[PDB]
Design a binder for this molecule. Structure first.
Ligand SMILES: Nc1ncnc2c1ncn2[C@@H]1O[C@H](COP(=O)(O)OP(=O)(O)O)[C@@H](O)[C@H]1O
Ligand SMILES: Nc1ncnc2c1ncn2[C@@H]1O[C@H](COP(=O)(O)OP(=O)(O)O)[C@@H](O)[C@H]1O
Lengths: 346, 975, 342
């Protein structure tokens, strides 16, 4: 159930009006949501891909990123939020009674194009992350609708973010990584080693199922909850970084203020666009119309999807396995610049 | 070891020259090394001095403008001033050898003397010199002088005084024989092919092929053809290094792959500098002959050889289509990220991108782009630097700039390259060299990998402090002055790439730039030149395939094969592309451009103007024809309904007979208007983008040429075509005439050209400065008058950009090069906010901001950057304007009441005609939107009233005709 | 899959400016192209039908027919081609640029001496050919890449009202009750077929699918690939004829009516076949579905529109590159369109 590898040929293909920038998987029902460079937002059920379910033009510009979340409470619906180049982040509501999109509201506060959003639930309260081209990470509240904290983690505009509890990692256009603790809003460590802008960075969440990089080393790393980070850039390389232990509002150690590249996965023919972690395998795509599958233990590519798209492969994702609220089903969908999307079944 | 420049292959001549050079130097005598460029004087000197722990080499490269101060500045970091005054070397055990390259280049004054030559003869004969500020005599103790030069018969060289060469021992270094060169480069090819052992038996034939190719290139392409056709063994070693790099960073090779790779390297080394297509074909045939003679494989053209590491992890030959698609997507991303420019990616664009990438991927690899303006030199350089991760540094050299600003920019770039390890691409335009001191600074920067004049005294000491701190940061263990500055030089050489943009290579400044010694022998000369007709066909097709063009019957005309430059004619699109290419060629032929490169800016501007104008015309024609058709259908339906089965409706139907006749005539002539739409749009776009700087006779002759050329390719046009009747509307005409335009048709055409230019900043040549007050009347109080000759102009322009005022800049012959991004329409978009960079800080474009440039001086100085990117309009008085002004003056001074009545009558008649036209348009709009009968009756009555007013007012024309006939002789004598 | 039954009630209601002339469905996306009697062509989304995506005043007169297809080039970027015919004696070729969702008018086709009545477009391995028919008693065959006609001849004495293209054979329906199948490359007739008493409305070929009418009879019929055809006229009867095999440039001999249909209360306008069921509308504002095996009406959709039904669009199930989506759009003269999704 964990060592599943997708087949060499997709079973169903999704056709979209323009370039597909982001795709997301519904944790519960077999339906995939598809973004569009033209500005539309689609949703296709996994079994009848001939026609969509709902599609509206909410953003006046190209969607840059989106994500999904199934809320839970101790006292319960899918929340989808979409960023774009239209200087506004739109929050929607997915009602399964009618399977129709319902807009909740729109968010403002950025001075340039926003490129990444992350949503997480903490104690019956959810927050939406956001990084934009104005060099600020303005993460916002879904309930109140106002801002919470604004900070500048890089000298150049931030291209991707990821949230693991109270910690956020940021990858920017200045070929550096910076880890900042959000509630205090202070930088903790700086990660250098790339020479081309970062495309996507995310945490390596701990798993309990023996993957080398998904397990804590010592007791302190297990207590902190995180040890390793994975990042991709325009270097045609994927690098595995490690978080040095801070002095613990954590205090950045002067002698432990730098990262360390534990591994450097290479073999792509162009810029690595998006990455995903499933068990011991790392799934990545690039502009070479190819998708790799990097084993974490061996640090070597296992399966290559030659010419999956006729153009660039913008995005892909898997099901999250580090969270018990979402069952890690064997679904993977890849978005392409050739106005097409491929979904692999079982 | 091919990369290392310190390797020397020991031959008989090499060891002989090296040991006699050492014997001469150990005898404490002056040495001058002479010979043709590329002989190996520097090579034999360095080989002799590497094996010695007794001497150090200080390299100074002389140019046309070298002073004693440059020689002393280059000696600052190597020599110490002691009072025992005496100028010892800093080292106590090693002597210092002052090596002076290109020593003939320091020019003479008006009395035939060289400052540097006399300084050096003072240094050798008297062993010292006089220190200028304190007037004291220093003594040279342990410094030797070695000179390198070319024979005085070489161009740019001057004879030296006999007092100089009396103290110097002269050795002549000649070109090695073909056998010796073959042996040298067969050793090099063995070293290269050690990486590919399966082809180790082909090292010798490759060496003979390369040497024969070099000899044939030297024989065929001589200085008498072009001044930059100087070949040397340096070309052969460049080709060898490129071959080694290409196999080193490439996949497993075959014999065909090796031969094609060697041919590609030969193309990039020997044939990049070729100007004419005849020499390109000669080199292609020469490569064919060399391969058949020495290596007994597909096509060996420049476009057929496309080796690139962009599409894969290794340097290899790639397909054209996938490379074009990859470059298209990458340039889309580049337009998104840095600057939005609507460019078309063509085959020669791809080849130039590949060779610029090849140059920028090297170490100590520079570029010298020579070609016409608006060819895609600096934008391609920035795109390639973005692809390679380099930082683009364009110096902000403007008017009122001196040596201090350029030295500051160069020092900042050098510090970023070395201390901050920022890999930098430095783009130096030919217009950024204000005087020859800038060129000397760049010569010093290129010849070495440092500028010793920029680091003197306390600046030198603080540079040492900064570099010591940075070296401690990296952890390298070095503390001596020599090793630290060698690390400085190595970092500068590794991280700095200089690209030169040259538009007119026949200018004296550009000729000195090309013929500069270090610029010639370090840069990779890439003669891009003007666009060949294939490139123009490709880009024209790629910008006219997205516009509705083919909507009428088209028969392919019978034309010669040599006169068709596109694919064989099948649609109107190919005929239009060929027509535009032919008119561009005829235009540049009739303006006696000669050997000056022909800029394609006119072609691209004409293409864009044609596309937008035909789109607008097609939309308007379709809408108008649909309106006429639905109006006729509604009238017919109403008539039929009335006939089948209310007096106001009957009267309205009866009164619409003339309107129905007009609609029927328009419907009948719709086919004729559709026949000649494309030709009219083409002629219009030629008017805006070509005829701005032409008088009426040149415009008429060129229109005749365009008309016969457009009829040649079976494209229809309006026989009675007129620019005013096609682009100038009545409302615009009245606005211009009440603003202050003259009644002259040439001025109306110029005003239509300047007003309908919404994509290029116009340029005005009005000696009378009438256009200034005309445009100030056009925009009223929101206009602003700036000038390039006034202080604080930059702040006023930035404030007007923020507010959105219409800006007119006088003194157009004094162009200020920091508004270049405004001139080139280089804007940065931040959502709904559009910003431009002026000076040193970004400023927000309001969107209502407009730019006009005015110049009242005919035959002034307009830089090629400004000249090629403006809609330059000439406002020069002609015979008709002089006659009109003479008649107006004589009628005002003879009978003022009659003149006032006549001009009031003309204004009333034209206003009534516009009212009638707008009333007909309103009648058509109201009829399309279907009380209403009463409104239509009122409109018809108003139209009848206007017609009666015109009929009554048209009874005073004979008096004006008689007055014109009376004063015509006065007007003709006045003109 | 291909045996889906359309819903009893319509799912979407889209309003147009005038009477609907021709309706085509985008084979890849929920996009419907509709042309009005004023010549304006619209692009409506199936999820947002309140406002069009793009509108262009293509023709100055009433639209007669429209056909769309997606190009499949082995080398060249893929795009969709819209061919629209009207009473302006000219046919324009369009292109759906979904990146910005607009219309680009690629080229037009001029030369017809009357009002073009029908169009039919097909794609070869690397070539696209344009078929058309007008009231000038001629069927002009054009080329999409070049733009000029490659074949022009008179197939019937009267005016051709419909035409179908399948390979090198074209079946033309005229105002006369007779039809004629002619070779396109040779420009010569092969067979003729009569039996009707009213002018023909729409004649379309039948493609075999790997069914009584979609299965080859012998090896020679499979080698030829064409055995049965469908025809419709104003006689309120749709008859399926049999195409005889000529002596193979083919050298030309009568069409035998192997089946017939009855029950239409008015003149039929469009005929659509999806798998084993054939759907056709008429001026009685009713849509009847007839199975090819039993040859009788199964389901009826009456009172769809106040006016007469103009045309209906169905995805082709005989094309590998075209997905057989379960959707059907029908247009009417009441300035409205009905969509049955799933
Ligand atoms: N052993 C050798 N004998 C002769 N020439 C050589 C030898 N090795 C290299 N060369 C060639 O001599 C050239 C050196 O020329 P260079 O010294 O730069 O010219 P200049 O003497 O004008 O400075 C190199 O480009 C190389 O190709
Ligand atoms: N391949 C191309 N297609 C279309 N336009 C081009 C192309 N190359 C250059 N241009 C025109 O040239 C301008 C930029 O060229 P640039 O590199 O600045 O030329 P230069 O270096 O001679 O000043 C642009 O405004 C563009 O319109």
């Amino acid at each position: 159930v964990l060592k599943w590898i997708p087949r060499n040929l997709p079973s169903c293909l999704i056709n979209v009006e323009s370039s597909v920038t982001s795709v997301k998987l519904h944790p519960n029902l077999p339906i995939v949501f598809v973004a569009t460079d033209h500005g539309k937002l689609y949703a296709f059920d996994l079994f009848n891909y001939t026609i969509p379910l709902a599609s509206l033009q909410s953003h006046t510009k190209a969607i840059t990123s989106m994500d999904v979340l199934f809320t839970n409470y101790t006292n319960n619906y899918l929340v989808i939020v979409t960023a774009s180049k239209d200087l506004q982040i739109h929050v929607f509501k997915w009602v399964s009674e009618e399977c129709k999109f319902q807009q909740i509201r729109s968010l403002l506060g950025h001075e340039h194009i926003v490129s990444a959003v992350k949503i997480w639930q903490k104690n019956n309260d959810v927050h939406i992350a956001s990084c934009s081209r104005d060099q600020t990470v303005k993460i916002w509240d879904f309930h109140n609708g106002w801002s919470l904290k604004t900070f500048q983690p890089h000298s150049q505009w931030v291209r991707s973010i990821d949230v693991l509890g109270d910690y956020i990692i940021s990858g920017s256009h200045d070929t550096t990584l910076r880890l900042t603790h959000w509630p205090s809003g202070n930088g903790l460590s700086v990660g250098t080693g790339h020479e081309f802008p970062i495309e996507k960075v995310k945490f390596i969440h701990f798993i309990e199922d023996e993957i080398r990089f998904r397990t804590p080393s010592t007791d302190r790393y297990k207590n902190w909850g995180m040890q390793y980070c994975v990042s991709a850039s325009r270097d045609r390389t994927i690098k595995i970084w490690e978080i040095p232990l801070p002095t613990l509002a954590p205090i950045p150690n002067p002698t432990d203020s730098n990262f360390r590249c534990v591994l450097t996965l290479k073999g792509h023919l162009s810029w690595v666009r998006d990455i995903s972690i499933r068990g011991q395998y790392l799934f990545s795509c690039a502009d070479d119309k190819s998708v790799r599958c990097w084993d974490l233990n061996t640090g070597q590519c296992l399966h290559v999807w030659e010419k999956l798209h006729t153009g660039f492969v913008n995005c892909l994702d898997l099901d999250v396995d580090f969270d018990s609220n979402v069952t890690p089903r064997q679904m993977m969908v890849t978005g392409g610049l050739d106005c097409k999307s491929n979904v692999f079944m079982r | 070891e091919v990369m290392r420049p310190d390797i020397v292959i020991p031959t008989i001549d090499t060891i002989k020259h090296e040991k006699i050079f050492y014997d001469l130097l150990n005898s404490k005598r002056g040495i001058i090394l002479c010979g043709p460029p590329g002989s190996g004087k520097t090579m034999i000197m360095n080989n002799a001095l590497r094996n010695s722990s007794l001497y150090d080499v200080v390299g100074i490269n002389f140019s046309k403008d070298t002073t004693t101060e440059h020689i002393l500045s280059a000696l600052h970091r190597h020599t110490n001033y002691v009072t025992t005054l005496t100028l010892l070397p800093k080292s106590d055990i090693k002597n210092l050898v002052l090596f002076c390259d290109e020593i003939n280049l320091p020019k003479l004054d008006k009395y035939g003397s060289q400052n540097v030559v006399l300084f050096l003869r003072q240094l050798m004969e008297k062993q010292g010199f006089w220190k200028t500020p304190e007037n004291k005599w220093v003594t040279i103790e342990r410094i030797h002088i070695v000179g390198a030069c070319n024979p005085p018969t070489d161009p740019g060289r001057i004879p030296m005084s006999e007092r100089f060469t009396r103290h110097a021992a002269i050795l002549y270094l000649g070109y090695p024989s073909g056998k010796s060169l073959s042996q040298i480069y067969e050793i090099y090819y063995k070293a290269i092919f050690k990486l590919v052992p399966e082809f180790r038996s082909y090292t010798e034939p490759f060496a003979r092929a390369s040497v024969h190719l070099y000899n044939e290139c030297k024989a065929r392409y001589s200085t008498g053809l072009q001044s930059h056709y100087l070949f040397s063994p340096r070309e052969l070693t460049r080709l060898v290094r490129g071959v080694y790099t290409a196999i080193n960073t490439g996949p497993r090779q075959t014999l065909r792959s090796l031969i094609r790779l060697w041919a590609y390297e030969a193309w990039r080394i020997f044939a990049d500098r070729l100007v004419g297509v005849k020499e390109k074909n000669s080199f292609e045939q020469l490569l064919y002959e060399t391969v058949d003679k020495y290596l007994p494989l597909g096509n060996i053209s420049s476009t057929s050889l496309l080796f690139s590491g962009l599409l894969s992890l290794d340097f290899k030959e790639v397909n054209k289509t996938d490379l074009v698609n990859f470059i298209e997507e990458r340039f889309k991303t580049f337009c998104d990220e840095e600057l939005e420019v609507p460019m078309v990616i063509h085959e020669s664009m791809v080849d130039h991108i590949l060779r610029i990438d090849r140059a920028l991927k090297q170490v100590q690899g520079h570029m010298m782009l020579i070609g016409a303006s608006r060819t895609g030199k600096t934008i391609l350089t920035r795109f390639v630097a973005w692809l390679n991760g380099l930082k683009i540094v364009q110096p902000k050299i403007h008017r009122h700039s001196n040596l201090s600003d350029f030295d500051m920019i160069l020092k900042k770039a050098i510090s970023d390259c070395s201390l901050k390890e920022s890999r930098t691409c430095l783009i130096i335009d030919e217009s950024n060299i204000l005087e020859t001191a800038f060129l000397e600074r760049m010569n010093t920067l290129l010849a070495n990998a440092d500028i010793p004049d920029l680091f003197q005294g306390e600046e030198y000491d603080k540079l040492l402090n900064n570099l010591r701190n940075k070296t401690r940061s990296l952890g390298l263990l070095l503390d001596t002055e020599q090793e630290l500055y060698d690390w400085f030089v190595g970092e500068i050489a590794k991280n700095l790439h200089v690209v030169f943009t040259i538009c007119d290579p026949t200018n004296n400044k550009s000729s000195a730039m090309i013929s500069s010694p270090a610029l010639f022998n370090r840069c990779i000369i890439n003669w891009m030149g003007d666009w060949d007709t294939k490139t123009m066909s490709q880009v024209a097709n790629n910008m006219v395939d997205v516009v509705p063009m083919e909507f009428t019957d088209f028969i392919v005309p019978e034309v010669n094969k040599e006169l068709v430059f596109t694919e064989p004619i099948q649609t109107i699109r190919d005929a239009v592309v060929n027509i535009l290419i032919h008119f561009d060629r005829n235009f540049y032929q009739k303006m006696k451009v000669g050997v000056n490169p022909r800029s394609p800016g006119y072609f691209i501007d004409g293409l864009r103007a044609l596309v937008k104008l035909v789109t607008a015309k097609y939309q308007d024609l379709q809408e108008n024809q649909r309106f006429v058709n639905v109006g006729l259908e509604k009238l017919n339906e109403s008539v039929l309904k009335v006939n089948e089965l209310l007096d106001r409706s009957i009267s309205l139907v009866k009164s619409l007979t003339f309107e129905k006749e007009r609609w029927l005539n328009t419907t009948k002539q719709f086919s004729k208007t559709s026949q000649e739409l494309i030709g009219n749009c083409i002629i219009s776009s030629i008017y805006e983008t070509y005829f701005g700087h032409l008088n009426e006779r040149e415009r008429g002759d060129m229109l005749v040429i365009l008309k016969r050329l457009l009829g040649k390719f079976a494209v229809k046009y309006d026989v009675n075509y007129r620019f005013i009747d096609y682009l100038v509307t009545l409302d615009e005409k009245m606005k211009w005439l009440e603003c202050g335009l003259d009644k002259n048709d040439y001025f109306l055409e110029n005003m239509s050209i300047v007003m309908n230019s919404q994509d290029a900043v116009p340029f005005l040549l009005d000696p009378s400065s009438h256009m200034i007050t005309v445009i100030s009347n056009y925009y009223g109080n929101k206009t602003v008058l700036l000038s390039f000759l006034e202080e604080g102009f930059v702040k006023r322009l930035e404030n007007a950009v923020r507010f959105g005022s219409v800006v007119i800049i006088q003194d157009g012959e004094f162009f200020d090069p920091i508004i270049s991004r405004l001139i080139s329409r280089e804007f940065n978009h931040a959502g709904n906010r559009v910003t431009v960079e002026i000076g040193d800080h970004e400023v927000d474009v309001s969107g209502d901001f407009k730019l006009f440039i005015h110049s009242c001086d005919p035959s002034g100085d307009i830089p090629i950057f400004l000249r090629s990117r403006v809609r330059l309009v000439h406002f020069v008085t002609n015979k008709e304007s002089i006659e009109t002004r003479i008649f107006d003056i004589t009628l005002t001074e003879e009978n003022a009441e009659m003149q006032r009545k006549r001009e009031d009558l003309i204004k009333l008649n034209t206003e009534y005609r516009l009212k009638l036209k707008n009333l007909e348009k309103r009648l058509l709009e109201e009829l399309n939107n279907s009380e209403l009968m009463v409104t239509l009756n009122n409109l018809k009555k108003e139209a009848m009233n206007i017609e009666k007013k015109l009929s009554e007012s048209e009874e005073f024309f004979p008096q004006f005709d008689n007055l014109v006939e009376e004063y015509s002789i006065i007007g003709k004598h006045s003109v």
